[model samples]
Target: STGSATTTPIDSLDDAYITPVQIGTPAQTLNLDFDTGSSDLWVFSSETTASEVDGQTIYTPSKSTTAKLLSGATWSISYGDGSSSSGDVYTDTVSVGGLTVTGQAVESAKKVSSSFTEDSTIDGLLGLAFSTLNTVSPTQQKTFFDNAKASLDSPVFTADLGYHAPGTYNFGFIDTTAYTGSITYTAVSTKQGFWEWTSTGYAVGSGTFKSTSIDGIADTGTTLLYLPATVVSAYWAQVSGAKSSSSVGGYVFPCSATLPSFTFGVGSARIVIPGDYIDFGPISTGSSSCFGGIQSSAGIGINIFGDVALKAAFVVFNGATTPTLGFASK
Candidate 1:
């Protein structure tokens, strides 16, 4: 989901590479987005009075001599495009990339939106994705991995962004060492708790896109890589000179050679999609083409394998070992 608390994503936008630890001192910097759909660790404050939040980046825990504020508890967040914010509730001392995690669990919005007051270069959101949509409230308990499992040196944390590159979301550790057999599980079908997919057909670049049945779902909360517009125009009419352009939002396209390499089976597992996931974003101005992996469904009954198809491999949603679902790779 976009940023966390409720979910916000107008096409990939949730950044929080942070640092700021207080209380007793030692532990700073916070990198965000561990969002398992929803929980909270939103940032941007200074008692945010709302003006549409003008370019967000508000953190004034009394000017951060390390920050900590969980006094009365207050926060408000909404998304689905209406966009909203409101905040208070804190306790900081965070660092990522070398791991430190002390106290953690923060949120300070005050009241925002104007696309987060106007995007002052993003600086908030660090939710650890998957605790059954936490906004805290297990009897007012805590979680940021329960204080990062004491201080994460590896208890398991893995996210590998590939296709579009920016997808190495690790933590703790889950690097299967590049997988070589034995790691197929699949069994979490409570119906719609997400982490469920099964397609078994569709190929491009190497050809074969004539009706590959469908039943997919692997949404990190969606960002791109959607399908079903007649299989995205029959896989761009078999690519090779594909041409379409309604100014990039109609489902983009262009042709300058080199475009073919795809796969998506899912029953015996094939799932490979790179070619920049069919490039789409940066439409015109500098000219970057190749769009249309099928769009125009908004959020139609969940079918997302976003993050450009979850950056290639290593996906595991083990609802605690068997109720199953697990894939592997580096």
Candidate 2:
């Protein structure tokens, strides 16, 4: 079996991508953030009061004939950004694109943070990372992709993120038409449940391709590319009037600055990110200072190649028992 979901960017800066998912009997649709950095398929539901609901499409289990409560099971998850949600569990039929998975644990939210309530476009999240990171207690559950892998033609999924445009999440088989050139394979370390890998090095535009190891996670949910401070500084150094601003939270520069392209190596293959993608729009509506798309991960432990970088290449999340990753130029 194979499946493909169309993911669309929420805003101009490509802050996040939302994919449509169907849950329960008779099928109810909900827009969810498909995050590769975490595991736990949770959604906004009827249990949440209107105060926290905002405009989100709530998943009402009682309306679905096949929805069954998983007694004593509950879940709570928080992201690095501090937004969180928690609720009791329910087993239901979940589908993405046209592929379906039965007896999937669906966490119904009873509470959600202000950040979630404020961002009304995304109703919840569909986690694609390892199940070990699931927040469900009493017993953790397999992720949607993990459960879908067995029935897939091949135990793999792919991400094709667009630049300020609609993208896709393909399951089971890779779409050769989605990418060009051969894919470069790399070993993945899922010890902590993320799609983690090590890059060969990076370059500012066509400058030096430093041969160094940069361990980071390929995260679709995160908006910015956060690397080591030195790496970020090097990329920004190429732009005129760029500075690491405390007030702006990260690197900022003149909106008219001539930014250089960023290139990161995958094995021996080099993936170059266009300079416009790094512009990341303005810091404010009409502000002259623009926020950098790449930032520093100094205190954050591990670096993250988020949407800023992922949008530049076609990524394969091979879900084999012992998983690996494949990257190809689009």
Query: TM-scores, in order shown?
Result: 0.33, 0.98
Which residue pairs show collisions in model 2?
A: none
Among these predictions, the greatest TM-score belongs to 2
Compared with the true structure, what per-residue lDDT tens digits does model 1 show for residues 223-284?
Answer: 56676666666667666656555455556656354545566665566656756555554454
**Residue lDDT tens for model 2, 189-296:** 999899999999999987989999999999998989999999998998889899999987999999998789999999999999999889887888999999999999
The alpha-carbon root-mean-square deviation between model 1 and the true structure, to one decimal in Å, is: 15.0
Q: Which ten residues in a row have the lowest lDDT in candidate 2?
A: 276-285
Off by over 4 Å in 2: none
Model 1 residue 232 lDDT score: 64
